[PDB]
Amino acid sequence: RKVAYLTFDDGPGKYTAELLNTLKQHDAKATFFLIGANVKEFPDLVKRENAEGHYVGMHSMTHNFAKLYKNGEYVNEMKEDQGLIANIIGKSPKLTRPPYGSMPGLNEGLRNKVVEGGFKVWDWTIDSLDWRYNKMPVDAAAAQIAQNVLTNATKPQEVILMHDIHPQSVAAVPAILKGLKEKGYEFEAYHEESHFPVNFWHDNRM
Amino acid sequence: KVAYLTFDDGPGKYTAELLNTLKQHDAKATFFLIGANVKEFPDLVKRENAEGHYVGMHSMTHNFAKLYKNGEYVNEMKEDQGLIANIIGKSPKLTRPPYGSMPGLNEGLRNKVVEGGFKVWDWTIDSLDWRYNKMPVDAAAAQIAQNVLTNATKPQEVILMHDIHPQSVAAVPAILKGLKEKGYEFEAYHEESHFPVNFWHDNRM
Amino acid sequence: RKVAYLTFDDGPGKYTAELLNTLKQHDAKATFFLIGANVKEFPDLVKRENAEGHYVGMHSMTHNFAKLYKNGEYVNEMKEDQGLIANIIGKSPKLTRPPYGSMPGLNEGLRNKVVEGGFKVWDWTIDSLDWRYNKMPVDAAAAQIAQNVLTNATKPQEVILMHDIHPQSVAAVPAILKGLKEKGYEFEAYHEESHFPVNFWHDNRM
Amino acid sequence: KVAYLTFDDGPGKYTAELLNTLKQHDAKATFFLIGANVKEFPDLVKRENAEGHYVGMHSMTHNFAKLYKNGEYVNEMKEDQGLIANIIGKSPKLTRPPYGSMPGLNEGLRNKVVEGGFKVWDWTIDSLDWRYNKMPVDAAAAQIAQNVLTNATKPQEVILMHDIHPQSVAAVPAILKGLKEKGYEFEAYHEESHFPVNFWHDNRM
C-alpha cells in the first residue's frame, strides 16, 4: 500500500484557493504549513483547508533563519502560529515544518526544546523545487515540476514539498495527482494519531 | 482566420500617413500608446479610435527599471489609461509591455495587473523593423514585409510593429496585400472577444 | 535558411573541453564570451576554441554590474579582456556580451561609448536558463535545459544563451544538437563579416 | 543479481557481532567509518578489512554545515582516509557523504572530490533503521528486514544501514536470508569494479 503526502509550504496565498479546488476534484487530501502573517490575512482559506479534510500545520511567523535558528525562536514562533491557527480552526496542530528545513538549523538544543514543547517536525523526501521555476512560461514550468515529482516516487511513502504561493506550483499539482495515482499512490493528509518521523536528523523523537 | 496588426511606441509623425493606408484597405488595427505621445498627439488618438481601431496602452516611461525592477508598471499603465480616457471617453483594459512581459512581468506584477483589471498582450511575429532604422525606406520596408509574411502560419497571429519608424509604415501597405492572400482578416482587438496572448502563457491575461 | 548561434558565457572552464569535443563530433560551430580571469588561467582553452572554428568574444573582466554600468567600465573591461584574448589568438574580436544582458545596464551613454570604441554588443533570443538547474540530478537538468531550448527555436535565426562553466549545461548540448538539427538548423559561429544587431535596446548601431 | 551492504556512522558496540553474522553467512559488506570511531576502535577497523570487507570514509565531523557550506568535505575525507590507511596500509578512495550527496555536494565540491581522486556513493535502499531507535529490538529488526526485502528489485542494490544501532544489526540475519532467496550475492565494493552511484547522477564519481 502506497501513500503520497502532499505538503504546501509558506501559504496560504492568492493561488491557495484554486489549489483547494483541484484537490476537491481528485478527492485528494493534503497538508499545509502556514506562515502566521498569511494566517491573519487569509483566514477563510485556513478554515477551508481544514473543513476540507487537509491537515493544517505550522511554518513559523517570520520564516527568518537568523531569528528561528541562530536566536532559537523556532519554538516560540511555532507556538504563536499554532495560537492563530487554533483561534481559527479550534484545534492546536502539533506538527511543524521548518523554514529551509531542519538541516542544519534545528540543532540538538532547539530539537530538545521542540520535543519538550509537544511538537513534531516534518522535513520531506521529495523537493519539487517548484519555486525555482519562476522565470519561464507557466504551463512549461508546471510540466517540469511535475516530472520532478513523478520521477522520484519510489518509496511506499513519500513526502512531497511544494509551495502554494506560486502559480507554476498549483499548475503542476494536477499532473502530479494524475501521475502518482496511476503509479499507485493515495493522497492522504497527515494524521497526528498516525505520526511517523520524517526529518533530516534521523531523530525519531519528532 | 484572423490577423491582428499592432503598433507600439506611438503616436508619432508617420501615424497620420499610416492611419490612411489602413482606412483605404478597410483594415482595423491596434495601437499601444505612450502617455507623452498621447499628451502631444491627442488629435491622432481621437482619430485612431474614431476609425475603428483599438486604442491600448504601452505605459508612461517605456523605462525598464521603473516598470519592472521598481514595479511601477500597473501604476504607469493606469495613469496612461486616464490620459486616454480623457480623449476617447472609454477606459481601455489591454496593455502591451515595453520590451514584452518576459521576464520583466514577474508573478507578483502579474497579480497586480490581473487585480487592476488589465489584460496583457505580447505578439507572435516581430517585424524586426528596428534593425532597418535610419536606412532607405523602401529597401528596409520590403524586408520588413518579407519578415512578416513568412512567419504568418498560425490561424491567429499578433504582429509587433512600430509606427514611429518610417520603414515600418512603408512596409505596412505591402504586408496588407500579402496577408489577405494567406487567407487572414485584418482585425482590431475587442475586449469582449478577449483571449490570452502572452509569453508567460498566463491565461489570467 | 536556418542558423542557430549557440553562445556560451562565463567561460572557459573545467567542462569547456568536453563541450569542445561534442562540438567537433557534431561538426558544429558556436560562440564563446569569456571572462578575463578565465582567459588567463585556461589560456590553452581559448586558443583551441578559436583553433576549432568557434568565435571567441569578450564578456568583461569583473562580471560586476556595479562596475560595468553604474561606473561605466563596460568599454574599458571589454577592451582589456580583448587585449588578453588577442595575446592568445592574435585577433581583436569585436563582439561583446554584457553580463546580465544589456537590459537595463547598457544605457544611452554607455551604448554611445560602445559604438565609439568599435565594439559590437549581443544579447540572445533564447535563455536556456541552464545555470539555474544547479540542484537536481545532472542528466535530468540537461533534459529540461534541452526542452527549454528545443521548444523556443522558432525564428529563422535564434541566439541561444548557455554557460560552458556548469556541468548540467554541457550535458544538454548533445540532446540540443540532435533536436535542432532535425528542426532544420545549422550551427554557426558569429562572423563579424556578417554582423547584424541582436539586443534588447533595438539599437542597430551595434 | 549482486547486493551491496553498507554500514554508516561506525564502528561501534555491535560492529563485532555483525561481523560474526557476516562471516557466518559467508557475506561481504562495506563500512563507511567516522574518524573519531577509527581512532577509538582500531581493532574493529583492522578486523573489518582483514575479513574481506571494504572500508571507506564517512567524514571526520558528520557535521552538515562544515562539510558542505564550508567545503571541508574533501579535507575531512582526506584526513579520514589517512587515519584508516595507518591501520590497513592502503588508502581507500570510496566515500559515503553524511546525509547523502544531494544537495550538499555542489558542482564546486563535486569537482574537488573528482580532483582529489575519490569516488562517492549514496544508496538505493534506505533501511530506515533510525526510525526504530531505542525501541524493542525484536520488533524493530523485523520491520527493518522487511523494509529492505520489500525493495529488492533492481539487479544491483546499495543498501544504507547503521552498525551503531542494535535493531539494525539484529535485522541483518533475516535480510541476508531474504535476498539470498531472491538470488542476490553479497559483495563488498571494489575500487577496480567501480561504478557510479550518486544522487547527482555524476558519473565522474
Ligand SMILES: *O=[S@]([N])(=O)C1=NN=C([N]C([C])=O)S1
Ligand atoms: O518552501 S520553504 N519552507 O520556503 C523552503 N524550505 N527549504 C527551501 N529551499 C532550500 C534551498 O533550503 S525553501
Ligand SMILES: CC(=O)Nc1nnc(S(N)(=O)=O)s1
Ligand atoms: C537572471 C539573469 O540575469 N541571468 C543571467 N543573464 N546573463 C548571464 S551571464 N553574464 O553569465 O551570461 S546570467
Ligand SMILES: [Zn+2]
Ligand atoms: Zn517556507
Ligand SMILES: [Zn+2]
Ligand atoms: Zn515599445
Ligand SMILES: [Zn+2]
Ligand atoms: Zn551517517
